[PDB]
Every structure is written in structure tokens, then in C-alpha cells.
Amino acid sequence: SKLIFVSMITRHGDRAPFANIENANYSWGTELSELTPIGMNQEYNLGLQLRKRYIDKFGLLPEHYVDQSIYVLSSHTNRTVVSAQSLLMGLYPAGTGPLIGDGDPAIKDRFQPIPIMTLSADSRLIQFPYEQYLAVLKKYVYNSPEWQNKTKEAAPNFAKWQQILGNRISGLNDVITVGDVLIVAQAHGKPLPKGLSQEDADQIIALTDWGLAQQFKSQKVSYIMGGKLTNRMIEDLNNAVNGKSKYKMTYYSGHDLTLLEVMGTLGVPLDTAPGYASNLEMELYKDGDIYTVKLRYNGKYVKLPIMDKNNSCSLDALNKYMQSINEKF
Amino acid sequence: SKLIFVSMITRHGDRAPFANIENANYSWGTELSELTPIGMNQEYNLGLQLRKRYIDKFGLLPEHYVDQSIYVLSSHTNRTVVSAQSLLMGLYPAGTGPLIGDPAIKDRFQPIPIMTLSADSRLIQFPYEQYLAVLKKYVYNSPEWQNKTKEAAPNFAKWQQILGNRISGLNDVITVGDVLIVAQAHGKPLPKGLSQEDADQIIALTDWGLAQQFKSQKVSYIMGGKLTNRMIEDLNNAVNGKSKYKMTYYSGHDLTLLEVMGTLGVPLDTAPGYASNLEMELYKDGDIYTVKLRYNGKYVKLPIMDKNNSCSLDALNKYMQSINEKF
């Protein structure tokens, strides 16, 4: 068997929070919501790892970029576009870019340009618009027994966390909000807010990770948000077989929700929220007339309920599996 | 006075033609329609020139990229996106990118976000069928076009037999002309039986044709009114505090430059070469704001501008309002 195609999703890297803790004086080194230099580095390193895998090991892709060999699509945010740019700067690094004349660089240090298209901000393909996302949560998640139960467990801490942080804390949604700020603060080596113990910080962060993952343990919620992208990735695999497409890779640059919704849709919901620069790949293999698929998440293969001992299944089986999911929803 | 804001449009660089000459065996070193390495270099060099101007000379922009200081928007093609990427690699080159004091990315590349319009957007490039519909309606039956067609018509039979490609009007001449322009830029031989004089002639008609399309302010406004308004609004937003950008940059095509210049009532006399560019510059001196218009390295005099190719922002707004009202 030989690898003949890959479809990939990433979450973007470390980024300055939109929210902030009122009773703290955190600054972020960039504008709110922007990818930080740390975030750029995370994605670049992922690019290097992908080069070692899909170029060096599998030889699916060549060492120098072939035009029209990779299709890249991003959500309409600076952080996802810059994350894709940064990753591609790892996959095809300085030194490998095009030459003109007598082996002179087209661009200083032989950077390799690779086009990235962006969805509109209104697109629901890669990230659900915030208002539509919350609408789904209010309808399907916030009133679920699981969410209600966890809320009751955590509720005794809300008053104190609010008095400490300043920020309103009146439910798990608010905990998730401050949780992102504490995650980035910790990543950047900032002190804890005055009066916030490390144990309390840990608990807030754990609830944040629990909450984001819990949202997508419903296959319904997942399909609502991710059925479209999941179908599209599988169609990409098919287009590689039926000759309709000549790409060796499609790459969707997105968010934690993007990974969560696709995994949730395929009936293999993540147990923990995706950290920065998390990624998943659908790999397609060919052996004569036999085509098989494998599914990789954060460096490990994932077993779909239709897969065999070796975490593989025919493309035909994957298509039938998706068809029924579509029929179900 | 001090420069406080700039809005810029570019045409992309050298790219492999979509069409080809049937009786020739040209290959392009990339897939059809893709930016070539030559094209990347053209845009990169433009970036370097822009750094010398707006960073080194005017100091509008700093030497290391400030997030949210530049807004970049491109048409939905590989060649326009890659052209913007390449230009920005000149404006903020290897060595200036962020640190974590170690490089965030090998050789300190500086990532700068580029958004893309949808393929059906009419802002930067009119979709092909809509563009041709405009031409069929307003251009192809114009006396200028008819007359030029009659002058060139005696050559159609010959050019068709030589090239293989259908040649039955100026539209077909423009098509093969694109191919001959790229062929010559890449040092390829002329098709067998095509004289240099004939090639020059085909290319001259091509440049004439593209420019002629936009000497109508109406055709220009139809295709370019939206973007022209948007650029002027960008300038106003720099003054009214609505926007914190120091520059907006629209990555486009020859048509994009042609339509904006045509809308402003200063239509180009010749078609934009690869990597051509236009900038609206905004200056502040106390409470006085003024604007200048730069195309391919030279200032352009709007009919409302003074001896120094400048006018108040207020005047530019009034001038555009009237154009809007006119159409």
C-alpha cells in the first residue's frame, strides 16, 4: 500500500484572549484575538513535523512545492490565516522556495508562497458564527442533564471567583470565558490574580476543558456544526480516486470547535478539549484496486467503529458509514 | 505635513496564460493561470521599494510589522493571493519577523494575514461572464472598437492560419496577445511564420484594447465604482477614528487598476504591466488633510487637484459624491 492523499484540519496556535480578567493587569504582546509569536512557532513546528512525515517518510509530497498540489482553506480570522501561513512555512521552509534565472531566489531566503483561501465570516463550514454557536448551546447543551449537573457541582465557587476576578461568574459559560484567559496567562508565565489560588485556577481550567469537550459528546450537536466539513473531507478523498481532483492534500485551518465537531460527527468525540495547534488527518492508501483509510489525531491513529484491528477501513466502508450518519441526521 | 495613511492596489505578477497558441509548443513552468517564479520576484521587489518609501522615508510604518496595522484583501485567485504574499515578503522581509530572542519561524519570516473575497465578488475582479457581458453591451459595438476592428481585420485570416487559434475579432487578438506577452517575457521563440512585426502588432492591439475598455467612465464605474468608494472611505476612516489601520491593500488585476483610474476620471492610456500599482496617500498638517494619487511611481493629477498634485480630503469626498450621483 502507498499513501496517495491526505485531508487535514488544524486548530490555530496561542492567541491573545478577547476577554480579560478585571482584577488583573494582563497585557498580551499583541492585539486581542491575534496569534502571538508563540502561536506562530507552534504552527511552524507542526509544519516541520508534517514535512518529516508526508514528504520524507511517505513521499506523498515532494521536497519543493508543486503548484496545485495542496488546497488550503481558512476561516475568516487573522489567527487561522496566520496559523496556516506559519504551518506552511514549516512544511515548505526557507531554502526550498522557487528560483529564477541561474538558481537565484525568487524571494529573499527562498520563501515558498502557497496560496490560502479564506471563507467569509458568515460561513459555517469551519467555524460557526458566534451567535449561531451560542444558539446551538442554549438549545442543545446548557439545559442538558450533564451541563445542569456539572453546574450544580461548581456553583458553590461562583460567588468567590467573581469577587476575586471581578468578571461576572454566574454559570459554566462564564467559567469557560475566564478559563481561556487563565490558559493563556499561564502559557505566558504571568502571575495568578491576587487571591486566586493555584487549586482554584486549576479547577477553572479543568472545567473549561470539560465544558468544551462535553458540548460535542452529542453526535447531534456535532453534526449540526460539523456535518458539512466532515462530508467535504470524505468527498476530497473520493475525488482523489475518481480523478476529479489532482490535489495530494486538502488543509482546513480552523479552531478547537472545528476538530471537536468533526471528531464528534464521526462518532469518536474527543474526551479532552484540543490544545493549541492540535490537528487531525484523514489518510488515503492505494494497493492496486484496494483503497483504505486511516484517521490520525494529535499523532495517534483513531479507531472508527467500522475499522479493523489495524485502525483501517476501505474507502467504500467509510462512504457507507458517512451515508448513514447523514441519513440519521 | 505628515503622511498618516495609504490605500494601495496592485496587479499580480507574471503568470502562465490560460490560453495557448495551437501551432506552438509552449510550456510555462507552472500550471495554467499560476503565478510564476518571475511573478513572485516582481511582487517581492515591489515590496522592497514600498519598504524604502513608506517605512524608511515617510516612517508611516515601523521596521517590524505591527499587528492590525495593514489590512490586506485579495481576489479569489491563486495568482493574486500569492502576489500579495510575495509583496509582503518584500515589505517585511526575512529577518524582521517575530521573536520568542529566537525566531518564531525559520529566518524570521513575518506572517501578515491576507483575506480573500469569494469567487463571485465583483469588488476587485468582475467575474468573467459578467465582464464579457459588460463588454458586449458597452464596448464591442462602440465606434472606437468597430473602427479599430476594421483597421486590424485584414490580418485576421493570416494570423489564424499561422497561429491555429480562431482569430475573428479584437477579442481573439487580445486572447493570443496575452500568450505572446508571456512567451516573450520567458524568452520563447515566435510561432513559425509569425514575424516580429506581426507579434508586436498583436501585442500593441492587446494593450490598446484593454485600455480602450476603460476610457468610458461609465464602464469604469460599473466595474470599479465600489472599490473606488471603498478606498476613499478607508481614508476617511483614518481621520474619523473609525479605523486604526495605517494601510489598506487590495490585491488584484489589470482590470482593477484600469477600473479605479477610469472611475476617478483619469483613465490609463496604456494597459497596466505586471506588478503595476496605485496608492492613495493621506497627509495631515494640524486640522488640514490632503490627498495625493500615485500610479506606477508617479503622481497623477485629478481634475480637482492643485499645481502640486494635491487636494483636500474634503474636495476628494465632494468629487466622488458627484461621480456617484452622475452614475
| B313 SS3 class | helix
What CA–CA distance (Å, rounded) separates A232 from A239? 10
A62 touching chain B per CB within 8 A: no
CA B174, B179, B183 angle in degrees (round to 5)?
140
Q: How was this structure determined?
A: X-ray
Give Cα B23 distance to the centre of its chain.
Answer: 31
C-alpha cell at B327: 452614475
- Best of A38, A79, A80, A117 to substitute, by most chain B Cβ atoms within 10 angstroms, is A117
Give the distance from residue B80's alpha carbon to the nearest chain A alpha carbon, in angstroms: 9
A41 Cα to chain B: minimum distance (Å): 5
Residue in the structure block whose three cell numbers are 475566564: A178
Instruction: Report CA-CA distances (Å) from B105 to A8, A231, B109.
Output: 21, 33, 6
Looking only at the bridges linking them, the beta strands covering A290-297 and A313-314 are antiparallel
3-state secondary structure of B23: coil
- DSSP letter (8 states) at residue B136: I
Contact criterion met (CB below 8 Å) for A186 and A200: no
Alpha-carbon distance A195 to B156, whole Å? 85
Q: What is the DSSP letter of B138?
A: I
Question: Distance between CA B43 and CA B50 in Å, rounded?
Answer: 10
- Angle formed at CA B99 by CA B97 and CA B103, multiple of 5 degrees: 80
For B60, the grid coordinates are 508611516
What residues of chain B lie within 8 A of the CB of A35, using their CB?
111
Residue B234 CA to residue B71 CA, distance in Å, equals 10
Element (H, E) at A9: strand A2-11
Neighbours of A226 (CB within 10 A): 27
Residue A96: its chain B contacts at CB < 8 A? none
Distance CA B24, CA B20 (A): 8
Tell me the C-alpha distance between B10 and B255, whole Å.
10
Which of A44, A67, A115 is opposite residue B104, by nearest beta carbon? A44
Give the residue among A114, A252, A82 at the shortest CA–CA distance from B114. Answer: A82
List the grid coordinates of B268: 490609463
Could you tell me if A183 and A204 are in contact, meaning their C-beta atoms sit under 8 angstroms apart?
no
Sign of the dihedral defined by the CA atoms of residues A50, A54, A56, A57, in that order: positive
Cα–Cα distances in angstroms (integers) from residue A153 to residues A156, A208, A252, in the given order: 7, 14, 37
What the block records as the C-alpha cell of A280 is 487531525
Positive or negative, the Cα torsion across B203, B205, B206, B211?
Answer: positive
Q: How far is B259 from chain A (nearest CA, A)?
A: 24
> Of the candidates A85, A98, A113, which has its C-beta nearest B111's C-beta?
A85
Helix (H, G, I), strand (E, B) or coil at B169: coil
Cell of B179: 500568450
Q: For domain A1-329, which architecture applies?
A: 3-Layer(aba) Sandwich (3.40)
A78 touches chain B (CB under 8 A): yes
Q: Are B291 and B310 in contact (CB under 8 A)?
A: yes
Question: Cell numbers 450621483 label which residue?
Answer: B325
Contact residues, chain B, for A117 at CB < 8 Å: 76, 81, 116
Strand runs labelled E in chain B: 2-11, 70-74, 115-116, 247-252, 277-285, 288-295, 298-299, 311-312
Phi-psi region of A98 (alpha: psi -120 to 50; beta: other; left: phi over 0): beta
Euclidean distance between CA atoms A293 and A276, whole angstroms:
26
Helix (H, G, I), strand (E, B) or coil at B140: coil
| Residue A196 CB neighbour total at 10 angstroms | 20
Least Cα separation, residue A93 to chain B (angstroms) = 7
What are φ and ψ of residue A59, in 5° steps? Answer: 60, 30
CB contact under 8 A, A44 and B113: no
Q: How far is A128 from chain B (nearest CA, A)?
A: 18
The answer to whether B113 faces chain A, any CB pair under 8 Å, is yes
Number of C-beta neighbours around residue B308 at 10 A: 10
Q: Which residue type does A115 have? A: P
**Residues B17, B165: Cα–Cα separation, whole Å:** 14
Determine if residue A39 is left, alpha or beta; phi over 0 gives left, psi from -120 to 50 gives alpha, anything else beta: alpha
Report the top-level CATH class of B1-327.
alpha beta
- A247 in B contact zone (CB under 8 Å): no
CA B160, B166, B168 angle in degrees (round to 5)? 90
What distance in Å separates the CA atoms of residue A222 and residue A300, rounded to the nearest whole number? 21
- B111 Cβ contact list (under 8 Å, min separation 6): A35, A40, A82, A85, A86, A89, B97, B105
Query: Whose CA is closest to A134, among A252, A35, A15, A221?
Result: A221
Please identify which residue in the block is written with the cell numbers 529573499: A108
- Interface probe for A, chosen from B116, B120, B124, B186 (most Cβ of A below 10 Å), is B116
- CB interface of A with B, residues 255-314, below 8 Å: none
Name the residue among A223, A205, A306, A213 with its Cα closest to residue A256: A213
Of B178, B183, B186, B185, the C-alpha closest to B203 is B178
> Hey, are the CB atoms on A109 and B107 less than 8 Å from each other?
yes
For residue B77, the Cα-to-chain-centroid distance in whole angstroms is: 14
> Does the CB of B171 have a partner CB in chain A at under 8 Å?
no
Residues A92 and A272 sit within 8 Å (Cβ to Cβ): no
Q: Give B200 to chain A, closest Cα distance, Å.
A: 25
Relative to beta strand B70-74, strand B288-295 is unpaired
How many Å apart are CA B155 and CA B167, to the nearest integer?
Answer: 9
CB A137 within 8 A of CB A215: yes
Measured distance CA(A15)–CA(A41) in Å, rounded: 12
Helices A198-215/A145-154 angle, 10° precision: 170
Distance CA A184, CA A188 (A): 6
CB contact under 8 A, A37 and B94: no
Look at B99 and A37 and tell me if their CB atoms are within 8 Å. Answer: yes
Query: A262 and A230 in contact (C-beta within 8 Å)?
Result: yes
Measured between alpha carbons, how far is residue A319 from residues A236, A257, A261, A280 in Å?
Answer: 12, 23, 18, 18
